[PDB]
From Swiss-Prot:
Activity regulation: Inhibited in vitro by GRL-0617.
Quaternary structure, from the entry: May form homohexamers. Interacts with N protein.
Function as written in the Swiss-Prot or TrEMBL entry: Responsible for the cleavages located at the N-terminus of the replicase polyprotein. Participates together with nsp4 in the assembly of virally-induced cytoplasmic double-membrane vesicles necessary for viral replication. Antagonizes innate immune induction of type I interferon by blocking the phosphorylation, dimerization and subsequent nuclear translocation of host IRF3. Also prevents host NF-kappa-B signaling. In addition, PL-PRO possesses a deubiquitinating/deISGylating activity and processes both 'Lys-48'- and 'Lys-63'-linked polyubiquitin chains from cellular substrates.
Organism field: Severe acute respiratory syndrome coronavirus 2 (2019-nCoV)
Protein's recorded name: Papain-like protease nsp3
UniProt domain Macro: residue ranges: 1-167
Length: 167
């Protein structure tokens, strides 16, 4: 039993809800919130820009130190950093950004990072400003993640189409 509430169940292990991931994380304070990161951990917009804003830029400060030490992530890769006031940990996951010409096949590799965590709050990887089809992203999520994932979809109109088209 967990404190995730109001989710529609899609599979044994995948759940979904129309919700602002920022407001969800503050309410639940999950063990892991997933960020839709880029390789530079520059949290300028999208889910990443919103989460960082909610941390009063502490996420960005921590991220800049991480990059200065370790260099950029790989597309499809991840790192675990602090969750600040939103969660215990933030799993920064880099899905391919179609608006940069990045290979969409790397989306499966990106979702594989979720399997290292028993329970996560997460957005659809490569959706929104990363330019991929959110329906496809949901399919890859369901077919790749085996741990318990609570997907937050910000757009109510997008949320309804995702549910209404799920096979
Ligand atoms: C930008 C943002 C703020 N809070 C959020 N919570 C969950 N998802 C998000 N953006 C990913 C989308 O696919 C959902 C609708 C268009 C992009 C956000
Ligand atoms: Cl977005």
């Amino acid at each position: 039993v967990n404190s995730f509430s109001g989710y529609l169940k899609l599979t044994d292990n995948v759940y979904i809800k129309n919700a602002d991931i920022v407001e969800e994380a503050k309410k639940v304070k999950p063990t892991v919130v997933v960020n839709a990161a880029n390789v530079y951990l520059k949290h300028g917009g999208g889910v990443a820009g919103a989460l960082n804003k909610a941390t009063n830029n502490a996420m960005q400060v921590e991220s800049d130190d991480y990059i200065a030490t370790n260099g950029p992530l790989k597309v499809g890769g991840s790192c675990v950093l602090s969750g600040h006031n939103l969660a215990k940990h933030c799993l920064h996951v880099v899905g391919p950004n179609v608006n940069k010409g990045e290979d969409i096949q790397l989306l499966k590799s990106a979702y594989e990072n979720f399997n290292q965590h028993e329970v996560l709050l997460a957005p659809l990887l490569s959706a929104g400003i990363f330019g991929a089809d959110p329906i496809h992203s949901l399919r890859v999520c369901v077919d790749t993640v085996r741990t318990n994932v609570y997907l937050a979809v910000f757009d109510k109109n997008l949320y309804d189409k995702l549910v209404s088209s799920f096979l």
